[PDB]
Every structure is written in C-alpha cells, then in structure tokens.
Amino acid sequence: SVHIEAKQGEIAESILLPGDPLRAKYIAETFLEDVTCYNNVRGMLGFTGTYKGKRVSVQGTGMGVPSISIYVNELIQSYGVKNLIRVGTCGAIQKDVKVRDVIIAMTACTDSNMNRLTFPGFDFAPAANFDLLKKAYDAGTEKGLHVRVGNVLTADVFYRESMDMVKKLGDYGVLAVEMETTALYTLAAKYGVNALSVLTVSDHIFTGEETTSEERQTTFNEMIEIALDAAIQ
Amino acid sequence: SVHIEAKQGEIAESILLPGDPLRAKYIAETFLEDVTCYNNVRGMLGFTGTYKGKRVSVQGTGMGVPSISIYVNELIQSYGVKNLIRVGTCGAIQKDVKVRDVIIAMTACTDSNMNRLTFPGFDFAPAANFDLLKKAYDAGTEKGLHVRVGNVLTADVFYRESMDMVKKLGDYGVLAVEMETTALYTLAAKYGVNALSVLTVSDHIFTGEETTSEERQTTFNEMIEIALDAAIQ
Amino acid sequence: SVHIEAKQGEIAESILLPGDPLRAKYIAETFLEDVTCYNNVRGMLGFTGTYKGKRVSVQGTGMGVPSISIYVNELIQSYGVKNLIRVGTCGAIQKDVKVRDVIIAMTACTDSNMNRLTFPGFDFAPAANFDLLKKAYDAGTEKGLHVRVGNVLTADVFYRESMDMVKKLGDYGVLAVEMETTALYTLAAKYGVNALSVLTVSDHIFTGEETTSEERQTTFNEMIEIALDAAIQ
Amino acid sequence: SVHIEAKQGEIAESILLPGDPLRAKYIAETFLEDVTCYNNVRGMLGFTGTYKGKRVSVQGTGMGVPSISIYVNELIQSYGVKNLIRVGTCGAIQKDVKVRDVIIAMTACTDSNMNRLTFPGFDFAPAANFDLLKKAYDAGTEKGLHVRVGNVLTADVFYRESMDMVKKLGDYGVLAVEMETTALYTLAAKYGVNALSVLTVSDHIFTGEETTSEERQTTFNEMIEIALDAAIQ
Amino acid sequence: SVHIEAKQGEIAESILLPGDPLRAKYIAETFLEDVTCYNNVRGMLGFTGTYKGKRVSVQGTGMGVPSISIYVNELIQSYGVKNLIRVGTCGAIQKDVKVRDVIIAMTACTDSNMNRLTFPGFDFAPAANFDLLKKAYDAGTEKGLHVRVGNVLTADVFYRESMDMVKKLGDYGVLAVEMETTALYTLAAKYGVNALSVLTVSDHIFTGEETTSEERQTTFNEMIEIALDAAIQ
Amino acid sequence: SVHIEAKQGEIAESILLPGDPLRAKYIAETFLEDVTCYNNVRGMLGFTGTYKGKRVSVQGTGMGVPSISIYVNELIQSYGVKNLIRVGTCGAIQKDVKVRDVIIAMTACTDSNMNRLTFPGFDFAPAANFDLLKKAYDAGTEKGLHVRVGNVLTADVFYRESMDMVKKLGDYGVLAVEMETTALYTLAAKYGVNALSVLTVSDHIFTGEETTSEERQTTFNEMIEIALDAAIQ
Ligand SMILES: Nc1ncnc2c1ncn2[C@@H]1O[C@H](CO)[C@@H](O)[C@H]1O
Ligand SMILES: Nc1ncnc2c1ncn2[C@@H]1O[C@H](CO)[C@@H](O)[C@H]1O
Ligand SMILES: Nc1ncnc2c1ncn2[C@@H]1O[C@H](CO)[C@@H](O)[C@H]1O
Ligand SMILES: Nc1ncnc2c1ncn2[C@@H]1O[C@H](CO)[C@@H](O)[C@H]1O
Numbered sequence A, B, C, D, E, F: 001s002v003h004i005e006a007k008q009g010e011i012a013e014s015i016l017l018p019g020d021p022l023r024a025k026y027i028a029e030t031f032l033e034d035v036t037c038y039n040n041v042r043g044m045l046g047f048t049g050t051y052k053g054k055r056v057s058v059q060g061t062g063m064g065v066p067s068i069s070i071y072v073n074e075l076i077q078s079y080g081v082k083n084l085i086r087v088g089t090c091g092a093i094q095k096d097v098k099v100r101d102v103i104i105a106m107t108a109c110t111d112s113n114m115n116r117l118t119f120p121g122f123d124f125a126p127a128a129n130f131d132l133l134k135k136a137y138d139a140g141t142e143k144g145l146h147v148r149v150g151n152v153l154t155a156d157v158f159y160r161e162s163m164d165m166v167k168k169l170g171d172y173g174v175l176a177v178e179m180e181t182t183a184l185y186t187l188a189a190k191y192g193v194n195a196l197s198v199l200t201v202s203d204h205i206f207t208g209e210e211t212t213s214e215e216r217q218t219t220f221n222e223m224i225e226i227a228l229d230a231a232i233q
C-alpha cells in the first residue's frame, strides 16, 4: 500500500498497533517467533511473527488520528486485517487513574474533526469491539493487572494552551488522554472489523508523573501479553 | 424535586428508567413487591418496591434527551440515586440486528447538541458503566437472550426527512436508534454514578417491522429481569 | 400513529398542546364538553371535545423538543391537524417578566441542534403563525391579561451547569425559557400549518420564584381560554 | 461616530434605515420637511427632517449584516436612537409571495455567523419589536397594502452557488431574502431599543421577476408611509 | 448587473476596490485620466480611466463580506474583471504594526460564515494571488513604504463586545482587522482571477490611535500608486 | 523534551522538517557535514549538521497535524528553534499542478479542528512567514524549478470516502493536499517564529500519477537545497 511495503499475505489478520514503531520492534523481538519485518517505509516498522503458535503482526502507527488512520485504512483495505489492537500509552486525567494501570477503551471522546466531517451534525461515539474488549478484560483480570474499562480522550493536540476541557472531561469520567483510538475504532467499525485499544498509563497529566519505557516495562509486557492473548482468540 | 413529588428516601438507589411511565407501572406491578407510587407529577409515574428482597425503583423518563435529562438530574441530585438502568426500546438500523434482540449500549452517538454545548469543540462519547454493563451482559447471556453490546444512536428526531445519516451510522456498526442514552450516560458520568441502557429492539427502521407491547412482552420481561438482576448486584 | 392510538378523524383540526398530559386532562375536563379521550399511549393523554360549540382537541406533548416533535409530526401528518397551540409554562429570564404573565412566543431561540441538522450553516428562526398570534394577543388583551409578545428560549436542558448564556439571552430580550416551541413552530412551518405557543410564566429562573398549578390556576385558565378563543376562530 | 459625522442631537430618535443611501435621500426629499443632511461619510447619506410634525431621520445602511451593524451600533450607542425601522427590499422565495408585497419581518433566519459567535451553541432568533410590528401591520392594513408578517432570510451571500437551502427555507415558510434584518433585530434587542424591518418584495428569486425603483415606487412610497406612520407613534 | 449599471466593456479588467465609494471618486480624480463614472447605483461609485496609459477602474465595495461579495461577483461574472485589488484601511491589532503601514494581505482569517457554508467542515484559507502580491510588495518596497505582508482578520463585526479573540489573533501574528478580504480572495479564487488587498493602517484597535483621510493621505496616495503600479503590470 | 531526546543546544535554530524521518536521514547524509543524530525517540530521527558552513538541523515530523504539532511545539518551546521549513510531499488537486512541481505554501486550508478549538467561531488562516517564503521562492526561481506559491490543503484524512470537497477546494485554487502545514504555520505564528512549507508534488490525486523517492529525487534534492538556502539566510 502507499505507506506499507508488505506483499500481499505478509501481514497477519490480527495485529497490534503501538504508536511507536520501536515498540513494534520491541514487541516482535520480545514476544514473537519466526519474525520478519515487512515494512520500513517512513521507518514505520511492521513485523509478522508467531505467538504461541499463532501468526500475528505488529505495526507502528505513529501519533495522532491522521497517522493511525493511514495505517489502519491500509491494513484493513489492502491487507485484509480483521483484528486490530492498539497497544499504547496514555496520560491519566484523574487522580483515580494510576500510572501503570491498563485502560481498555470502551469508547473515545475527541477534539478531532474526523467524525464531524463524516457525520455532519452528529456526535459519533467510536466503540470498541465488545468481544475483543471482553477477551482483553478477562485476560487482564486473570493476569492480575489493574484494568480499567472506560472512556478516553483521543486528542489532536498533545500540547494544549489550556487543560480546562481535559479536566472537565476527567470530571465526566474520561480516564486518560491518548491520540489514536477514535480513528482506530471508527475505521474498524466502518469496515466491519474488530478493534480495541489497550493502554498503559504512562503519565499523569496534572500531577506531572512521568515514566520511561523501562519504568513501565513489566506492566507493558503484561499488557502486550493480554493484547496478544486477546488477539490469538 | 421540580418534577418528582417523592419525599426524601422514597426512591431507591437503584432505579430502572423506562421511557414510558406506563411501563414503569407494568414493571412495578409485574416484578416488584411492597410497591408504592412516589410520583405522578406530569403522569410520569415512579414506583419503589422490592425485588428478590432488594429495594428498587422504576421511573418513567419520557422520550428524548431533554425529558430524561430532567428526571436523571433530579434522581441523582435530589434523590441520591446511584445505579440507573434505562430499560427501553429501540429501532434496529441494520438487518443484522433483529426484533426482540436486547441491546446493551456501550456508548451512544447523537444528533443532540447537549454535549457540544458542554464540551465545545469536542465529541463526547457517553460511556456505560462497565461494571453494570458486564453484569447485565452476563445476566442476559445466562438468561439465554440474544444480547448485543454495542453502539446506539440517541436521536432527537424520531421523524427524520432523510434516514441517510442513520443508515450511514448503521454502516459504522451503530445498532439501533433510541432517544435517551446519551443523556443518561453523560449525566451519570457527570455525577459519578452508574448507568446502563438495556434496550429491546421493537422495530426495524428500514424493514418496517414493528411490534406491540405484548408481541415483545416475554423478551421484555426477561430484559427487565436482567436490568433488575444487574441492579440488585 | 406510532404514539397516538386515535382513529382517523378523532382528533380535531385545532389542538391545544400542553406539555403535561395531566394538564390536557384538566383542560378537557374544565373547558370542553362532549369529551372523549382518544389516547393513553405512554400516558400521553389526548382528548377531543367541544368548546363553545366548536370541536377542539388537547394533547399532551411531554417535555423537550424531541418529545413534542413526535406528537406534532404525528398530529400533522397522520391526523390532519391544522392549528396547534402550545399552552405551556415557562421560566422568566428577566426581572421585567413577571410570574403569571402570559407570553406569546413570536419566535424561539434554542440550544437544540434540530434546525442546524435541517439547515446546515443557517440559523433558522422558528416563527409563530402571525394570524394565530394576533388572535391570541387580541384575546389576551381583551381578557385583561398581562400579555408579552416576544422571544423565548427553547431549551434542551432544564438543568444547566451555568446560566450565563441564558442570562445573556435575557439581555437580548429573550423573555423566558421553555422546552418545546422551536419544534412546534418549525414543524408547523414545515407542513404549512399554523402554530402558536402561549405560555404562563410559572417561575423566575434567577429570582427563584416558583408556583404550583393552583397558584397560577386562574391565570392559567384565562390563558387556556385565549388559546381556545384563538383556536375556535 | 466613526462612520457618521453627525453632531450629537442631529439624529432623531426614530429612524428609517434603507439599505440604499440614495433611497434615504429619496425618502427625505419626498416625505420630510425641514431636512438636513447630517452625514455623507462613505456616501452613506443620513438625513433628519420632520414628518407630519414629528422629527425623524433616515439613514442608509449599506448591504449586509456587517454594514448595517456598523450603522446601527453607532446610531444606538452614539446617537441615542430608539426606534429603528429598516425599509428595504427583498427577494421572494415562494410563489405565494408576490412582487410589491410588503413583508414585515417577525424574525429572520440567517447564514451569518454573527449570532453564533455571540451565543455559541445556540440558535438566536432575532425578534422584531412587537409594538412596532403591530403598528406597522395595522398601518399597512389600513393603507390597503398586501402585508405579510413572517420570517425572512438575512443572507450574507446574494450570489449563492446553489439556492437549495434558500428553497428549503421557503418550504419552511420563509418569505423572502434580504441582507440586514438579523443584525438590526439582534442589535436592537441587545440595546433594549425597538426595531422592525418593513420590506418591499422587489424580485422573485426563482421566477426571475425583477423590478426597478419606479416600478415599485407607489408601493414603496406607501411602505415608507407606514414605516413613518409606525415611527411617529 | 444588479448593482452596477455599467454597460458591457465599460469596466476595465483591472480594478481597484476601495470600500468607500468616495475614495473611488478620489482615486479616479487624483490618479486617472479620461475618466468616466460608470455606476452610481446605491451611490456605489465606479469609474474607469487611464493610468500611465493603461485603462483601469475603481469601484467602491461598501463594508463587509456581503457587500464586497456582491460587487466582486458582478465584476467578475458580468464584467469580465481579471485583476482586483482592494485598497482599503484596517485597524492594527499589534503594537508592532503602525499607523500608516501598508499591509498586503497574504491571507485572511474571518469570523464570517461564508466559507464554512461553502466548505462544510473545512477551514478555507483565502489566498492572495502571489503574482500580484509580489508586484505590489516590490512596488511598495521601491516606493519606500513600510510594507508588511501577512495575515489579516476579515471581520463581520466592527463593534465586538469583547476584543479577546481579536487580541488572540494578534498573538498569532494577525496584523490588522478589516472587513472585505476573505470575500475578495475567495471569490477571485473561485473564478480563477487575481486578487490582492493592500491596506493602510488607519487606526490601532487597542491603542485607540485614529486617523482622518488627510492624516494618512500621502501614504494613502503612495499605496494607491502601488496598487495601480501592480495593476498595470 | 518528551519526544526528542536532544540535549539543550543540540538542535540548530534553523530546521528542516520532512514528514519522513528516513528523509531526515537522507537530507543529513546528503547535504550536511559534521552531522550528529540527536534523536531516535520513536524512530523520529533528528540530525544537526552544517550546510555551507551554517549549522542546521533536520527533524522528521511524522504525518498529520497532531504529529507535527508535537515536534514543532517541542522544537520551538524546548529547543529555541526559530526557522522551521517543512520539506514535504503533496498530492496535486488540479491538472494545472504537475508532479515534481515545488509548491511553497502561502497558507493552508484544513479539515482539522485544531484552529477551530483555538479560535471558536473563526476561520484561522495559517500564514507562512513572508520573508522565508520570498527567500525560498527566489531561490527556487534561481534554481530553475517550477515553483508555485499558493494554497494547500492540510488534511487529517489521507483516505477520504469522497474527494468532492477536495475537488471543490481545487476549484478554488488550492494546489495540493498534504498533512502538516496548518499546524506548522499556526504554531510558528503562535510563538513568533518563522515557518514555511516547501513541497514536492509527488502524486496527482485524481489522475492517479504516483512517484517513488528516486523518481523525484533530483527535484527533491533541488527543493531541499532551496529550503536549506532559505534557511541559511
Ligand atoms: N499525556 C498524553 N497526552 C496525549 N497523548 C499521550 C499522553 N500520554 C501518552 N500519550 C500517547 O503517546 C503519544 C503521545 O506522546 C500518543 O500516541 C498518545 O496516544
Ligand atoms: N425507531 C425508533 N426511533 C427512535 N426511537 C425509538 C425507536 N424505536 C424505539 N424508540 C424508543 O421509543 C421512544 C420513541 O418511540 C423513544 O423513547 C426511543 O428511545
Ligand atoms: N425554568 C424553566 N426552564 C425550562 N423549562 C421550563 C421552565 N419553566 C417551565 N418550563 C416548561 O415546563 C417544562 C419543564 O419543567 C417544559 O415543558 C418547559 O417548557
Ligand atoms: N434577492 C435578494 N437577495 C438578497 N438580498 C436582496 C434581494 N432582493 C433585495 N435584497 C435586498 O437588497 C440588497 C441586495 O440587493 C440587500 O440590502 C437586500 O436586503
């Protein structure tokens, strides 16, 4: 496809979608066997391998609705991908949500215009595939993770002049901010395929708490495992 | 409160919210014991009774975001209600959704402006309380119902000059149209309480299929049972 | 129709539209002769009777644009109703508007999206039928009522986190808040029929002044009389 | 003021507001005595004179919301003007509205953003002053004119790539298109003063019928007379 | 055309577009030879003459997007005009922009809805014709003027209840406020013709600094010269 | 900064901003001397080197407004970057714009909501820094490139269900589609720094014409040279 140089059939029907292509590489190296790298266009690494005997892929998406939308469109339309699980990070809005929690997004709010353009006059609420959601939730619960299922904000702007609205969203139960889910969920719905976002809380927007990769790496691995565990079902 | 003449403490912390006050009466009469009617302001009947030993209420909401918003605000703010389960009907958008299916709304799309006014520039995705959702889903699954968990449209207009957008939403996986969930979910989130909408598909918008109360009454009863079963947990 | 169980011809061409179905019952019992109740679907009572020799109906609408829109659409499209006069209550915004004043809405502002969806990019100003307006105004003037003809706000939300905009509207001459007129006026215009809203100021939003039915019942009756007097012309 | 070079007190409290400054000149010359021209800034002629013994002014506004808004703001804020009657032309949308009809605008729809900016999330319906409206209506009725009281469209664009929405508005009873009323009515309301627009139908948008000044001059004069007759009351 | 009484061929292909028709007259009298006045409809004077041997016209536009849109549409569509240079005034937003500076608008921001209506969901950035822009810039530079090339605000409202947004725009580099450029640039682009706005800073919005015609007349003349110098190329 | 691991001072004040980090690497390797790679967070390579004796950096941005906004914010706020030149690709909308043309964006249209959120009610037109624009234009002209200065569309969605609006924008002179400029220009303006986008037309949206890196590599190099030539001034 335009942004993915894979040959037909090289991408598995189940795919994990980290924002960071280097995390795709990490996931492939850490969890998968019989790995090949099928894409390095724009450095947006994608890999296919085998996990517990099942083929799976992992494809970076970049950050933001427009970037992930490119990849998701191509994966679905050009590569026949059926199950797409974003494995990402997010920033907690509320004190009640803690760093290293895993958030499974039921739905996402957004400041993107993408859905307003598609559905003028409507608020489109992008919805996770419940099957996948339940699988991931059950896997996370069994794995002993702190799993929160709820609402997230898919933001176009990481750096907002005022966080007032973000705070307000937090007061309405929105758990965390991230930059992809609206697009993933909307496009998956458009094409009748199955999507989920499983997120690790990496930072707390208002408390300032931040983490490096390694500082959330055990939790991150466990999260990847549940995203993979859900995927291979 | 302005629209509910109940004394403090007369409304249980768990409440079912049919749109039709006559369905509130039906639910109270059919399922509850030790029933009292605490409201007949505007004919919007509300009852409190006991179900399998647990106090529960049932309160009509009327149709539409503005009507249910009145009642939900009052129930939450004036009567301390904590668990609110709309038990309603809806119109299927897709052929894949069948009359008498039970839909548990994860989230809701809307053509209402209510959330645009609250969150200018954002698409707010109103989210069910996952705990309640899971309880209802599990109860429905155990009850042997066809339960679909997914997205719905909360419509301001029942009678639309064109159903093109509704169809488009259906193509994006939106299961059914109804007229309350956005408000319920948004307000419950605002106030940190727990909401869910459990819906019986009563009609199919495009196929023209329609049902009367009795024609979906067995399924309706089973749905009420799961809404009550979820509530009493 | 879907929400009205009347047989064809049971609903008169002129109809009063209180929000409260119990007020429909009151109006029928108090003012009409040869009354029959043609609807009790959803408790949304509707009656037809005779007033000073002329057949007239009275139909509750429920609260909010979506609710009244259902009934008005059905009345117009399915029952051939030609003259629709909402007889309602409203909350004064300004000190200059007093409890028990009668407001005849020339037009209505709204926070509803209903007209934005119909007329993207436009502000649609829903307009009363001037003939009816003048009749009601003249009748009210002759009846010795305080009648104010002006602008109202048709609100989707009764319970607003901030009344700043409502206050601002008041500063622009908007007299009172209510929850139906935009829809009535817009739909009547759509279908080329005649609508008016005649409102009793029942409360003052900022002063906190409130009234019960009986506390405005003499004025309310006189208002009903002018709505009927206008209707039978 | 910035756009009006009149000294304080030179502008009467009642003013007619044609869009065309040359029509202001015509009105002053034709109807007024003891006339002085108080403004020729930007050629936007303004005059004050006496009509049937009462001082009155006439001030061109130019075309469009932004132009009239300038003048109306200045007239109200800087010159203490209290009664403002636009005397304009308009283009009929419907066949039912005929060239040379006089339209008294109750309210106005618009494609302007002016009110969306002032009242985010709301549709503001600009309303005529009913007193003035009634006076003009009664005067027009007594004068034997075809007077239509209703809704108009205040357009920002005279030349629209598609008239579909304009047609749709016509189907919702909007009588005619013009380019000032929203602003006049909104600003008058803002400042607690009295406004009305009295319009002569000069063209029919869809039929192509057009008129020159002289071809509607007798009707135009009669309209000016009612705007003056209303003003001097 | 509807608003211009010129015969075909009387308007030159290059035209200057002051907002003030009296400035059109000034420009024609001061700079042009062999002048005729081709329009006095609505007092909106238009002239054609010769400048340094080249035919050029000058046409008032009135103030605001709707007014200039009328004239520009007619000039382009009915009179075959190809190069349109607004020669106007503007109010500085920033201290960094000084009275008597000449601003050449690259683009314009707006609070008008005109482009939202044309391009729903999009922000249309109206762009100057670069050729013309460069010509004017080079001419202004050679003339020894302070020329600023940048962004302007095309405002619908001259009199804003709050200048907060205007200030904010100034913080984003918007140089000055005026009331026409969006329309000129958008329409010129629509029709594939060439437009530019060259503005004299006549006032400073926040400092209160104001100028009369004569107080900026030397600079104004030089600006007209560059608009003419650009035009005749 | 959060997404750039550079130490303070490692990033030059002038920076080129390709969307593709691999193009950053190409630019650094091909044009710069004394190169160091200061960032590989998320694979979003950034380099600093020397070009014709002047320090310059090159930093990938990723695709889309949200991605570039992250990097631009960080570059400006955390690294004191002053001159930012996006060097990108774009898709021609019109036949009149040819593959391998270089487009210098004066401004950008967008379907992003980013500016609507910042400037509610306004259309913000993001503007290039004219100085930089002129430098790049002059350099491109001297280099013998086909340089087009004009308007572009900054799209959030690469894959649009309908290109109707894109076509319409093309009819209004918008030259090409890309996915970053609005953000770059807006943020640069916000922070008072200098931005430009210089684009190579790599594809034609409607004709289907596409190019690989090498197929536009000579032109691409020349474009990079002008972006560098402009930068080092
Ligand atoms: N606080 C945050 N705000 C926005 N996005 C975040 C945040 N924390 C993590 N992310 C995620 O990481 C990237 C932004 O750093 C995006 O892909 C986004 O999903
Ligand atoms: N087809 C439908 N469209 C909208 N609302 C529906 C539909 N079917 C059932 N409903 C529900 O019933 C009422 C409208 O008849 C509302 O309360 C709504 O939730
Ligand atoms: N203050 C108020 N705000 C909104 N609606 C009101 C108010 N007072 C009376 N109403 C009317 O009564 C109902 C809400 O109580 C609605 O039908 C509405 O029209
Ligand atoms: N068909 C029309 N469309 C828009 N404005 C019109 C029309 N006919 C008359 N007008 C009025 O005349 C001017 C435009 O020609 C405006 O002031 C407007 O109010």
Ligand SMILES: Nc1ncnc2c1ncn2[C@@H]1O[C@H](CO)[C@@H](O)[C@H]1O
Residues within 6 Å of the ligand: E019, E062, E063, E064, E088, E089, E090, E091, E092, E155, E157, E158, E177, E178, E179, E180, E202, E203, E205
């Ligand atoms: N401060 C200002 N605000 C708006 N428009 C201005 C300003 N200064 C000059 N103008 C220009 O002059 C007219 C408004 O006085 C408009 O045509 C506009 O372009």
Ligand SMILES: Nc1ncnc2c1ncn2[C@@H]1O[C@H](CO)[C@@H](O)[C@H]1O
Residues within 6 Å of the ligand: F019, F062, F063, F064, F088, F089, F090, F091, F092, F155, F157, F158, F177, F178, F179, F180, F202, F203, F205
């Ligand atoms: N046809 C196109 N549509 C959108 N973006 C494009 C196109 N061609 C090139 N681009 C650019 O390349 C990336 C998308 O492939 C974005 O960074 C964008 O700026």
